[PDB]
Ligand binder design. Sequence first.
Ligand code: CLA
Ligand code: CLA
Ligand code: CLA
Ligand SMILES: CC1=C(/C=C/C(C)=C/C=C/C(C)=C/C=C/C=C(C)/C=C/C=C(C)/C=C/C2=C(C)CCCC2(C)C)C(C)(C)CCC1
Ligand SMILES: CC1=C(/C=C/C(C)=C/C=C/C(C)=C\C=C\C=C(C)\C=C\C=C(C)\C=C\C2=C(C)CCCC2(C)C)C(C)(C)CCC1
Ligand SMILES: CC1=C(C/C=C(\C)CCC[C@H](C)CCC[C@H](C)CCCC(C)C)C(=O)c2ccccc2C1=O
Ligand code: SF4
Ligand code: SF4
Lengths: 74, 139, 80, 161, 148, 739, 62
Amino acid sequence: ALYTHHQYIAGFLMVGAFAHGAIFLVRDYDAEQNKNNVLARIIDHKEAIISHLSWVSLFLGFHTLGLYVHNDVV
Amino acid sequence: TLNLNAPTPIFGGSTGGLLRKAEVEEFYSITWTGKSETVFELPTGGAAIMRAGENLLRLARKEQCIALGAQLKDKFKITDYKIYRVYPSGEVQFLHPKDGVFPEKVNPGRVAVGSNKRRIGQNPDPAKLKFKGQETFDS
Amino acid sequence: AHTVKIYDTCIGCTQCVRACPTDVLEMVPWDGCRANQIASAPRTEDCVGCKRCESACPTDFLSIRVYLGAETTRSMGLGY
Amino acid sequence: DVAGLIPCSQSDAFERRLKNTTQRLENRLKKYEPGSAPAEALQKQIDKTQQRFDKYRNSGLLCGADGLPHLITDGRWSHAGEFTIPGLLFLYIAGFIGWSGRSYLQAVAASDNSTEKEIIIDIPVALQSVSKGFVWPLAALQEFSSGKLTARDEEITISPR
Amino acid sequence: PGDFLVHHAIALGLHTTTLILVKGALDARGSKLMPDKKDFGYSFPCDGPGRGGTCDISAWDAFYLAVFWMLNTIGWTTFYWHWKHLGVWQGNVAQFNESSTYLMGWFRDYLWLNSSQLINGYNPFGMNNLSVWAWMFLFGHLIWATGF
Amino acid sequence: KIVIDKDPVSTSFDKWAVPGHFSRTLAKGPKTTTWIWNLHADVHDFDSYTSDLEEVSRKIFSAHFGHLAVVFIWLSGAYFHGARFSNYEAWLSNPTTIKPSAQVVWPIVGQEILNGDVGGGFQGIQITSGLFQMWRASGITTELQLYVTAIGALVMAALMLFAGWFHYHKAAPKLEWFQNAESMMNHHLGGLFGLGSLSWAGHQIHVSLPVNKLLDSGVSPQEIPLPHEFILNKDLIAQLYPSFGQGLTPFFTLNWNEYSDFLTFKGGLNPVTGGLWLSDSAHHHLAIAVLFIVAGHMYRTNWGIGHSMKEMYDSHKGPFTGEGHKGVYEIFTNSWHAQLSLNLALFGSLSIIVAHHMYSMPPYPYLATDYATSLCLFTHHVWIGGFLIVGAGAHAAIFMVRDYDPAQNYNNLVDRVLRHRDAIISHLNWVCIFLGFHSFGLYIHNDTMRALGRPQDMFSDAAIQLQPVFAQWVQGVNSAAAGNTAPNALANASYAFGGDIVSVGGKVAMMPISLGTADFLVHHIHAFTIHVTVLILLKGVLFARNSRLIPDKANLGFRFPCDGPGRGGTCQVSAWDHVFLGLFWMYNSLSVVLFHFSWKMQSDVWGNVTADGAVSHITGNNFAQGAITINGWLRDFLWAQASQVIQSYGSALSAYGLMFLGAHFIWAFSLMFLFSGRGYWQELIESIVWAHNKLKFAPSIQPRALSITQGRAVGVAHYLLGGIATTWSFFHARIISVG
Amino acid sequence: MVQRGSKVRILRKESYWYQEIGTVASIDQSGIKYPVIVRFEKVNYSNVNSNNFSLDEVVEVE
Ligand code: CLA
Ligand code: CLA
Ligand code: CLA
Ligand SMILES: CC1=C(/C=C/C(C)=C/C=C/C(C)=C/C=C/C=C(C)/C=C/C=C(C)/C=C/C2=C(C)CCCC2(C)C)C(C)(C)CCC1
Ligand SMILES: CC1=C(/C=C/C(C)=C/C=C/C(C)=C\C=C\C=C(C)\C=C\C=C(C)\C=C\C2=C(C)CCCC2(C)C)C(C)(C)CCC1
Ligand SMILES: CC1=C(C/C=C(\C)CCC[C@H](C)CCC[C@H](C)CCCC(C)C)C(=O)c2ccccc2C1=O
Ligand code: SF4
Ligand code: SF4
């Protein structure tokens, strides 16, 4: 019960981390003031980060599911 | 003006219309002259019959008046519909046509309300308008 | 009421006016040209917020915007 | 012997999986008529089983305590045929299908009706891209070096900042 | 080798939950669909049925889809913690050894085999001290299904 | 009056090239990828693009020929695979012991373990379709009679497919050939239903009854003469029911009493097989034929005599209901959807009536002892029936948007239901909430009472009793009806109400299904779940045109996702979205009916009989005290009876185990489409078009996300497919092992 | 100064065809703001192919 307690909270804390960073980008972020730093560069190639996260999500899920469905059928 | 009393169409029905909201504040009435004795669907249920008229119908919402006012322009080509909203237990007379003409037609003397002298990509960031009474789209 | 703002990239196409189901919009002559028109929203208190005026605007990323503000009885579309 | 895994030729749990698989088919055979057609399909099933245990014993696989062949991907060359060799065999085939469909779309897009030729597939241009797709590990090398494999970011459309 | 397959399910979960969360983080300020997504705020339903229809478009609804994914990822995590230790504690480590490699042993020997003494918390012959858990089990099924 | 057109459509492949040729919206080319789904969506909706009711109805007529082709193609495969790949010849010698089987599996990667020890000297899949029991009741004894019927269906499939080519391309009938409903009702009643039951009554007398009279005497399927010898050799038809020696002179001289041995009213179950008496079903369809042939001379045609359906509706009007049925004939001879919805309602309502009348009165020999088939035959036709009832509420809604005319409907019975729809829906709204509290809450009460150690406070048979007295009385008037009020019948209409235990082999064929406190609860679960399913669909029909929310919902269409986020939010307002929501509730309603059925029979009805006469059922009479709590539904039904679908790996039932988990996947995959929305993916795809536009190969057919209406549709499709195929695999793997 | 038929690249950051190639169909010979009409191969989400831009948002890549 102690492992399962803190891991479910850690997932809620890690989801809420990206959630409150997302609220910062609508409310508090100012692209005319924030330019050419680390923050305004990650926004600049944000399509490169999502699509490469779109691959490793789809790379594992195609294969470790098929590795399971192989072992099921066999 | 509203010209009440004016004859209601020969209808007799519709649970779905003009409940307790109408008697306290803000119901509407659409008035037209129908050039037949023909049947038309209501926004409540469907039929009535349009009179020779001076025809009038008391509706609950303005949205139901423009929906019926579109049907009289579509199916019967009677575009003379003239909606209203009532007095002391209502708010504002003569809602449409507001300047003697339909809103899709141009009429000089109207003033551009809600206009912006900028594009939408020229909208400021909300961080520039933070902790102020300004909003990120008003000018 | 919902706020309706019309931006200057409008072309006087008159399509958002006739797609309005609650008769919010209208066409008005333009100042700097006196020939073309623009949409205008003088009846924003009637606006239900259906955003049908944005589905009819032909410009790339439409010149008329609807920002859903406070919900009155008209903008909630309530028959009661 | 890389993780306590005994080879399967001397692994007794793997040699005991064979004793129970055929005993579950010989008792399935023991009731049927000996000359019948379901009788010979079980002996075709018994001998297909013996052709996978003798195929896994002589191949030098690694069986654990359960007796099932485990695969070792760190790639060692003594265990190269598990993931490294069919992985290289995979990557050419997938890149063949990849570079073919990419070469097809660049040829089609500079035509009159490009979207039409995606629905009905031009068997000239389809078999042309197969010919341009077999040479893809060589063809992508001079494609990347020429500067026309990728595009600069002022040419792609991109969300507002 | 059963512990191999779960850690890549876990690595799939942490990558996918990050994928949704950094989707609405970086695309909180506009895309080709809605360029002015900063004018509408963090939490708003949609921009209507125009432009193809924009349901769940906002940065709030990218949070909202990743809460399903973290529950699933911790669900993959703590099912693996619990069933690995259920053979460690019971001295029979071989149950996780052969059955965890394929998804039916994950289903038959963890969710079906272990939920037997729970689900007899109250039978028509008596009741145990687990009947508060067997009640809250079914109580949890009913509230989960109501969210649907 | 037959009137046609000669060659309106040529037989060319010019339109086979271009997809989307039929509509002005399509065939310009797919600029985006929605066009690929816009094409497959509005193909067989002929009413949208074609604006001529004459041209629309010709498409509809010749398309049913194509569907008649694919049923005949499917029927030939039912007959071919029984001819070649089945143990039908060995099964007739020992029908109880040998499991029915077809579909031998090929010796490839390991799926030849599915070819199990199914009986005799054959190895294949134990099938649960009842074709072995249907072909035995038809009299078939050898595989050659199945082989020619498979050829006979394929030539009939080509005959229907040629007839669909002919009646659209060559000789297409006009509009006035389709609007003749009275001549159509005359022809389908006496000709399709009457002669179809007259000619089948000829088969059961000359063919089925003689071979079954020797099969239930039990000689051999080889010693029995071929069924043409019962037509030629009249001495052979005289040694069994010797009333054929008098010919058709008992028929024409009205001395019908001489046919008292092959036209009976015995009315029970065969003690040798456990099916209905074939001489009952011989007398049955003969009586059905005469009722159908006589009823086909009712409606008027070009010979003056006959009823007119237009003048039956005129002057069927009361004082409550205004102008009466005036206008419903003109609606029904112009709307193809109002004809579709009503014919779908009573096709699906019938398909559940077929399921209820076939487990209790098993029509085929050795269908009752075959528990593996009688459960799948029930659960199939229930599931088929509920889909069609949702199609009734679907196509009634499509009628309201474009086929409803307000000028033709003033104060009739369509107008007056659309005028008090707020009284219909809200009174329907209350009766679901009343039934949801007072049926499901009585399970929640029984959970809480058994959890708290209070078993004397729940609703049970050893507790606060809720006995079903309105159903137990109807069990009494139908179990004591043979000899008193149906006096010619020897036994009752079924043994389900009351009667002996018919024991064929060692197993129960039928026994009286008792009713108790648990049966009060589930039958009110059924009453509840149906009334919500009505409530969603009927709300879609009555509000398809307008509401207080959107007064122009018919100007927007039958199938549109929303009117925006305004008016608070108008998502799923259309008539299509109520069909979408009713599909889950139909899935919710029917799955309890099949859970009620699968455990009522296993505990109280199905089982074995010992050599003395005591019955030992399958699950051991645990429906009475288990099925009153949700925990007993979980512990004693879903957990206890899925012990065969998961212990099936490594055995011949393994594909039920793989279809079990594989349908849990597709069900849970559907929530990805249902719970989420489109505009997430349209900006996720914008990151994937970029990573393809980076390497200069993004497709010219631009990728789009699925639409809001499609994302709902692709989520409900995988939801039902995920849960039915789970229930498919759980039912099959259970009753094959125990029944 | 852009003429008709010239292949341009769009610098309007809010547009669907931002940093993409299109051919100018026409220019309006008056003082109207946004006179440049560009026709694009790719349709946006409202499935249109034209828009009115200014000369500040286009270039002359030809
Ligand atoms: C200490 C850390 C922390 C802090 C200070 C905040 C603070 C805030 N958050 Mg953040 N957030 C956090 C962690 C935190 N959050 C976490 C862990 C998550 C992921 C779950 C989020 C995800 C998140 C989102 C998406 C949003 C916020 C928003 C907000 C702001 C308003 C919250 C509000 O008014 O909601 C009101 C509170 C509720 C409605 C609570 C009801 C929900 C709970 C969970 C119900 C519990 C169920 C029930 C009681 C269980 C019963 C038991 C059962 C057995 C019967 C406020 C600035 C909002 C914002 O707009 O920021 C500007 C916003 O949109 N948060
Ligand atoms: C064999 C010769 C032949 C030829 C050349 C044509 C040619 C034509 N037909 Mg005709 N017709 C024919 C026979 C033929 N037909 C037959 C046998 C029938 C009875 C079904 C019809 C009934 C018919 C109708 C009602 C209509 C046409 C129409 C047409 C025109 C366009 C059709 C098209 O392009 O889509 C080609 C279509 C296909 C390739 C799909 C065929 C689908 C088949 C029939 C069933 C497939 C389902 C199958 C069981 C799959 C199940 C799922 C699977 C995964 C297992 C074209 C001139 C249309 C027309 O004239 O519009 C003005 C039209 O409305 N035909
Ligand atoms: C298991 C999950 C679940 C539950 C509980 C419900 C419940 C309901 N649905 Mg919903 N529905 C569901 C899944 C569910 N649905 C899903 C997945 C979908 C998407 C397809 C829908 C879509 C849908 C539609 C389209 C409709 C419904 C409607 C309804 C209501 C039917 C009226 C009724 O009989 O209430 C009876 C209440 C119960 C059976 C709940 C049991 C609770 C007990 C008896 C009482 C609670 C104990 C205690 C008093 C609690 C209070 C104490 C506390 C405050 C301290 C009911 C509230 C219908 C409706 O609202 O019409 C009236 C309707 O039209 N639902
Ligand atoms: C094993 C080991 C090691 C290593 C370790 C390491 C090095 C680690 C690292 C770690 C890491 C590497 C971690 C990280 C993490 C991270 C995270 C946690 C992230 C998150 C993020 C976020 C959430 C963000 C957000 C946002 C946004 C999106 C926007 C703006 C705002 C913000 C920023 C808020 C050592 C050497 C010691 C030694 C041996 C052992
Ligand atoms: C050896 C080995 C290993 C390792 C591996 C690694 C670690 C790798 C990495 C790698 C990497 C980290 C890489 C990445 C890459 C990057 C990039 C940047 C890419 C690019 C690409 C492209 C651009 C594409 C192209 C193409 C092709 C190639 C084909 C088809 C067509 C296309 C066009 C698609 C392991 C242990 C597992 C196992 C054993 C063996
Ligand atoms: C996943 C998902 C998508 C994305 C799904 C998409 C875009 C469907 C695309 C998947 C198919 C499989 C692409 C098929 C591409 C080719 C046809 C493949 C051809 C391969 C040949 C060899 C046959 C939505 O668009 C959506 C919209 C609204 C609500 C929920 C969802 C939703 O859940
Ligand atoms: S809807 Fe927008 S683009 Fe169309 S006329 Fe009005 S302001 Fe101009
Ligand atoms: S489906 Fe789209 S338009 Fe309809 S309510 Fe949801 S977000 Fe708004």
